[PDB]
From Swiss-Prot, chain D:
Region (Disordered): 80-101
Protein family according to the UniProt entry: Belongs to the bacterial ribosomal protein bL21 family.
Protein name: Large ribosomal subunit protein bL21
Subunit structure of this chain's protein: Part of the 50S ribosomal subunit. Contacts protein L20.
InterPro entries assigned to the protein according to its UniProt record, in alphabetical order: bL21-like, bL21-like_sf, Ribosomal_bL21
Biased composition (Basic residues): 80-91
Record-level Gene Ontology MF annotations: rRNA binding; structural constituent of ribosome
Known role: This protein binds to 23S rRNA in the presence of protein L20.
Cellular component, GO annotation: cytoplasm; ribonucleoprotein complex; ribosome
Keywords, sorted A to Z: Ribonucleoprotein, Ribosomal protein, RNA-binding, rRNA-binding
Superkingdom classification of source: Bacteria
Source organism (scientific name): Staphylococcus aureus (strain NCTC 8325 / PS 47)
Phylogenetic classification of the source organism: Bacteria, Bacillati, Bacillota, Bacilli, Bacillales
Pfam families linked to this entry: Ribosomal_L21p
From Swiss-Prot, chain E:
Residues annotated as transmembrane: none
Family listed: Belongs to the bacterial ribosomal protein bL32 family.
Entry-linked InterPro entries: Ribosomal_bL32, Ribosomal_bL32_bact, Ribosomal_zn-bd
GO biological process, one term: translation
GO MF, any single term: structural constituent of ribosome
Pfam family, one: Ribosomal_L32p
Signal peptide (residue range): none
NCBIfam families for the chain: rpmF_bact (TIGR01031)
GO cellular component: large ribosomal subunit
Protein name as it appears in the record: Large ribosomal subunit protein bL32
Swiss-Prot record, chain F:
Record protein name field: Large ribosomal subunit protein uL13
Gene Ontology CC terms: cytosolic large ribosomal subunit; ribosome
MF annotations from Gene Ontology: mRNA binding; structural constituent of ribosome
Function: This protein is one of the early assembly proteins of the 50S ribosomal subunit, although it is not seen to bind rRNA by itself. It is important during the early stages of 50S assembly.
Species of origin: Staphylococcus aureus (strain NCTC 8325 / PS 47)
From Swiss-Prot, chain G:
UniProt subunit comment: Part of the 50S ribosomal subunit.
Ranges of compositional bias, category Basic and acidic residues: 1-18
Source taxonomy: Bacteria, Bacillati, Bacillota, Bacilli, Bacillales
Domain of life: Bacteria
Family according to the record: Belongs to the universal ribosomal protein uL15 family.
Cited function: Binds to the 23S rRNA.
Ranges for region Disordered: 1-49
Protein name: Large ribosomal subunit protein uL15
Ranges annotated as biased composition (Gly residues): 42-49
Full-sequence portion shown in this chain: 1 to 49 of 146
Native source species: Staphylococcus aureus (strain NCTC 8325 / PS 47)
Length: 111, 154, 116, 101, 53, 144, 49
RNA sequence: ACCGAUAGUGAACCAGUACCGUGAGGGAAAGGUGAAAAGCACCCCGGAAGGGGAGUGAAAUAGAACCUGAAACCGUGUGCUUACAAGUAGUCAGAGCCCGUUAAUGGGUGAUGGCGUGCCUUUUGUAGAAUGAACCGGCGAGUUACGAUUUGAUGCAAGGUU
RNA sequence: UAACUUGGGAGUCAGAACAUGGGUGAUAAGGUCCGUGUUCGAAAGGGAAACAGCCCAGACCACCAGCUAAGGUCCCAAAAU
RNA sequence: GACAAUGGUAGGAGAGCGUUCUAAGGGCGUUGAAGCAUGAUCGUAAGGACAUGUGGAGCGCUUAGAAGUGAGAAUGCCGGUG
């Protein structure tokens, strides 16, 4: 049995978020939480809240035992990009992509 | 066309030096929102053929009806008031198909009004006969007077 | 009336892309480079249908040569002897015989030598 | 036991019960065909045709009259706006060898 | 100087082979049982080396 | 109808031969050995698989040359460093590394393909009359 | 004759030829004008005579 | 036998607006929940955003620029494969392994062998180190009017035609 | 087995190498200008390592059949150690 | 039945494919249209079917008619994304 949680349109670039997701993919929930708490990156708290939300619905909606859960899936898809510009020299402007992420976590009891 | 589209007077950027393709107006045809190259322009499609060929065409359509046995001659239409139901009954009693062209000698108001609302039934006069109407019809129902008038004319 | 671009374009390009299945990277993905590669594939296949007949005759000749040498005869003299003996078995069949039943091939070799 | 038969401008090494594919024969499916050009018989007793083994025959049953898989013949000459695409399906006859001689 | 040819998806991902982060160097706090950074105070319970900070 | 036999690793049998270089001419011995290594002497020769046999060449030090090749045939190589040409005569190489002399002569007669490299690995050359491969039970092979 | 079975007289009609619609037509690209010169230009070509 | 949201007005929409210019002046982008708002009571993680349930609905996988949702591009999983190899990337030959279809002398992958310097343009001749294209999508070029001529068709014919 | 006449539609007017008869240049040029032939142009296939213009030879499509051309037959690499 | 031809740039000639609209006839569709997606399907080519998923209301077919009728390149225009 599986429980899922998604944080949509997080204002962090997906390359950056996936750096951290790659650390917790496939690990036990408690180890994943610890990894997130002790990893010093911008996306760690956001991912942690997604993971905690997923565990919370595992418990409340599906009466799963949260101490036996593993992070079965973890990924970030591209959300819509905020388009910005930076003035550069000689009257020119250059694009700035403020990218966003949809962060999905799925936890599972393996059953 | 490119003249007709709004704006577009000025050269969008200088001929050389910017690295872009050379362009002469924002309304050129390759531009989104630009003028259309050729395309429709109002015109008539009507044309003529010799009168003898017109008459031959009408006779050919009428002969096709006669040979296909889709020609019925009636003594007269004695309709005093318009009645679609009565005209429908007359058609059924004459055993007519769905598509009937009814020909009177002259404008017959009550026949026109009684047939007008029946799908597939068209009413005309002897003078008003035309190839499209005859050909579209499966059967022609012509009064004796109208038939004689047609015979005189053609 | 206006005829908008419609669906034909996508259908045609998709066909070329499907023909490019298995090609490397962009060549199975982008219509322009897939089209080019499929053109090259057609030209190569046309050429290689012809080259294949050459290649297989070459293989048969090599194997016949080996068998003849095992019987102390060169390929060239074996083929000449078979010709003078009137035996019309072609190189494919000779190679398959030499592989599959050596006694029969030895009999063919003796026929060739007797003819020479 | 095997035989070398000539058919369709080619030569085929055949054993009894073997399925073979040859150039289209003028026969119907389920008919019996007789190959009358036997160049060679191998196995226990060997017979060497010069060119053909006299009287030797191979009989077969016509399983199918088919068309080979589609070939797309395509060629072009670069920079010359010149190309040609044609389709081809080569007819074939499938038979099963019943009896050698 | 500028890229003469764009970089393939394949070449880009090969280059990124080593672009990654590692799991932090962490161990279980002997006092409270929660994970902590080795040689750091445990933030959950404030303990280090069997003493409160 | 397609009926050509194709050799593969399930049905390939590679034997071991010994060939004596003594009194043999470098190039002629080399071409024959190369054929053996490539499997050109087998009726089951199949171009895309190694159907060849293993070859041991003994008495490489007694291989012989014609003419003045001993002093006039020069082997050049380049270290990929500027001016990095190095040369050695065929006679000097026969004196100091006859095994390499034969190995290079033969391998220059094999295709520069992955398969050709693999096939060339089946050659074993020794300057003297002994070889260490009795375990493979090689058979004497007569040239020509 | 019927409106769903119309047929023009044999040989009375022929489809117009359309240039600049691909190489197979034989009138793609240069559209039958050959290469360059005055006569290859939109509106090009000299006065009759 | 006019357009159907890159079309059709510049403007389907709060457009001569926003924006640009001292000014004359230039001048956009941007349509679609559902039949009905019935537009998600309540519970749960979260500061919120966001989400999981529950419920409304035929459908929420129609939840607010909310019909459809292609391609480039970005990810996760995996069947086959790859760390001695020199590659316009395919093609022809071909074991091994994994599958099983519009059931067809099947599908996926590919150890290894042969062959093989993109496309367009422009040229006497271009792998060309000559030109063009980052990629994908949409849009983007012999038309119509009136005369001329020729050919085919048809009617009539020393007449034909308005 | 073409040829000519009339009428509808064209494109072309930068040509290259090779061989040979000549001018020019220096019995220089992958030079340049004429005559003659071939090929390329607009021609794939085999040979000349690779190599438009040389040599053989003109691809309607299919075959895991045969004979040859130029050129070749010790190994790369088919065929004579 | 025979046996003859079928390399090709500019270019001439022919026969066709497919797109939107119209006319007439004949059909399909909430028991699921178009569109999209996938497949090992068919035709000498352009291209045509069929099945399944998605989708949710329109669309084929036949004959004829008419054209804003086919894009890979224009340092093309606009958008999206590398
Ligand atoms: Mg400034
Ligand atoms: Mg640029
Ligand atoms: Mg417009
Ligand atoms: Mg429309
Ligand atoms: Mg288009
Ligand atoms: Mg045409
Ligand atoms: Mg042409
Ligand atoms: Mg073009
Ligand atoms: Mg022309
Ligand atoms: Mg041009
Ligand atoms: Mg010119
Ligand atoms: Mg010209
Ligand atoms: Mg739209
Ligand atoms: Mg608009
Ligand atoms: Mg506008
Ligand atoms: Mg939508
Ligand atoms: Mg390896
Ligand atoms: Mg030219
Ligand atoms: Mg030049
Ligand atoms: Mg380069
Ligand atoms: Mg230029
Ligand atoms: Mg460029
Ligand atoms: Mg484009
Ligand atoms: Mg010159
Ligand atoms: Mg010159
Ligand atoms: Mg000359
Ligand atoms: Mg050539
Ligand atoms: Mg060559
Ligand atoms: Mg011969
Ligand atoms: Mg050989
Ligand atoms: Mg032709
Ligand atoms: Mg020909
Ligand atoms: Mg033409
Ligand atoms: Mg168009
Ligand atoms: Zn602690």
């Amino acid at each position: 049995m599986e429980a899922k949680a998604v944080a949509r349109t997080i204002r962090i670039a997906p390359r950056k978020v996936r750096l951290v997701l790659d650390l917790i993919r496939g690990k036990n929930a408690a180890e994943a939480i610890a990894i997130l708490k002790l990893t010093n990156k911008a996306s760690s708290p956001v991912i942690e809240k997604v993971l905690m939300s997923a565990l919370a619905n595992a418990e409340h909606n599906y009466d799963m035992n949260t101490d036996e859960l593993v992070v079965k899936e973890a990924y970030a898809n591209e959300g819509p990009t905020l388009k910005r510009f930076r003035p550069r020299a000689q009257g020119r402007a250059s694009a700035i992509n403020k990218r966003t992420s949809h962060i999905t976590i799925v936890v599972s009891d393996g059953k | 066309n490119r003249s007709a589209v709004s704006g577009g007077g000025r050269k969008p950027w200088k001929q050389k030096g910017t690295g872009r393709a050379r362009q002469g107006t924002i309304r050129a045809p390759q531009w989104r929102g630009g003028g259309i190259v050729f395309g429709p322009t109002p015109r008539s499609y009507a044309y003529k053929m010799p009168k003898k060929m017109r008459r031959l065409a009408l006779r050919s359509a009428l002969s096709f009806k006669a040979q296909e046995n889709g020609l019925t001659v009636v003594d007269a239409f004695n309709f005093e008031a318009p009645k679609t139901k009565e005209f429908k009954n007359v058609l059924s009693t004459l055993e007519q198909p769905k598509k009937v062209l009814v020909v009177t000698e002259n404008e017959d108001v009550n026949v026109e009004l009684s047939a007008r609302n029946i799908p597939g039934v068209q009413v005309t006069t002897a003078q008003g006969l035309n190839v499209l109407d005859i050909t579209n019809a499966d059967s022609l129902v012509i009064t004796e007077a109208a038939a004689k008038k047609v015979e005189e004319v053609l | 009336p206006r005829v908008k671009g419609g669906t034909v374009t996508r259908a045609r390009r998709k066909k070329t892309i499907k023909l490019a299945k298995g090609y490397f990277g962009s060549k199975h993905t982008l219509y322009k480079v897939a089209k080019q590669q499929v053109m090259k594939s057609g030209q190569y296949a046309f050429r290689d249908r012809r080259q294949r007949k050459r290649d297989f005759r070459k293989l048969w000749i090599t194997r016949i040569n080996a068998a003849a040498r095992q019987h102390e005869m060169s390929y060239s003299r074996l083929m000449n002897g078979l010709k003078k003996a009137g035996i019309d078995i072609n190189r494919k069949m000779l190679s398959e015989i030499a592989i599959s039943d050596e006694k029969a091939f030895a009999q063919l070799v003796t026929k060739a030598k007797d003819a020479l | 036991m095997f035989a070398i038969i000539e058919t369709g401008g080619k030569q085929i090494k055949v054993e009894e019960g073997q399925e073979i594919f040859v150039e289209k024969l003028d026969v119907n499916e389920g008919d019996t065909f007789t190959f009358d050009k036997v160049l060679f018989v191998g196995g226990d007793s060997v017979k060497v045709g010069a060119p053909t083994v006299e009287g030797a025959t191979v009989t077969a049953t016509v399983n199918k009259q088919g068309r080979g898989k589609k070939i797309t013949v395509f060629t072009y000459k670069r920079r010359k706006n010149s190309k040609r695409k044609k389709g081809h399906r080569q007819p074939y006859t499938k038979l099963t060898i019943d009896k050698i001689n | 100087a500028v890229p003469k040819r764009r970089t393939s998806k394949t070449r880009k991902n090969k280059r990124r082979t080593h672009f990654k982060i590692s799991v932090p160097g962490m161990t279980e706090c002997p006092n409270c049982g929660e994970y902590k950074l080795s040689h750091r105070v445990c933030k959950n319970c404030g303990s280090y080396n069997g003493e409160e900070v | 109808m397609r009926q050509t036999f194709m050799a593969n690793e399930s049905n390939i049998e590679r034997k071991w031969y010994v060939i004596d270089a003594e009194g043999q001419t470098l190039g002629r011995l080399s071409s024959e050995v190369a054929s053996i290594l490539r499997g050109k002497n087998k009726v089951t020769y199949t171009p895309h698989v190694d159907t060849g046999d293993y070859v041991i060449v003994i008495n490489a030090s007694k291989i012989e040359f014609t003419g003045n090749k001993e002093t006039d045939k020069v082997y050049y190589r380049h270290s990929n460093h500027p001016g990095g040409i190095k040369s050695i005569t065929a006679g000097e190489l026969r004196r100091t590394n006859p095994e390499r002399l034969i190995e290079n002569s033969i391998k220059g007669m094999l295709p520069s393909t992955r398969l050709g490299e693999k096939q060339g690995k089946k050659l074993f050359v020794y300057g003297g009359a002994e070889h260490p491969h009795a375990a493979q039970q090689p058979e004497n092979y007569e040239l020509r | 004759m019927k409106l769903h079975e119309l047929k023009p007289a044999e040989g009375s009609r022929k489809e117009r030829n359309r240039v600049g619609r691909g190489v197979a037509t034989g009138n793609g690209k240069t559209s039958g004008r050959g290469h360059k010169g005055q006569k290859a230009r939109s509106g090009g070509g000299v006065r009759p005579g």
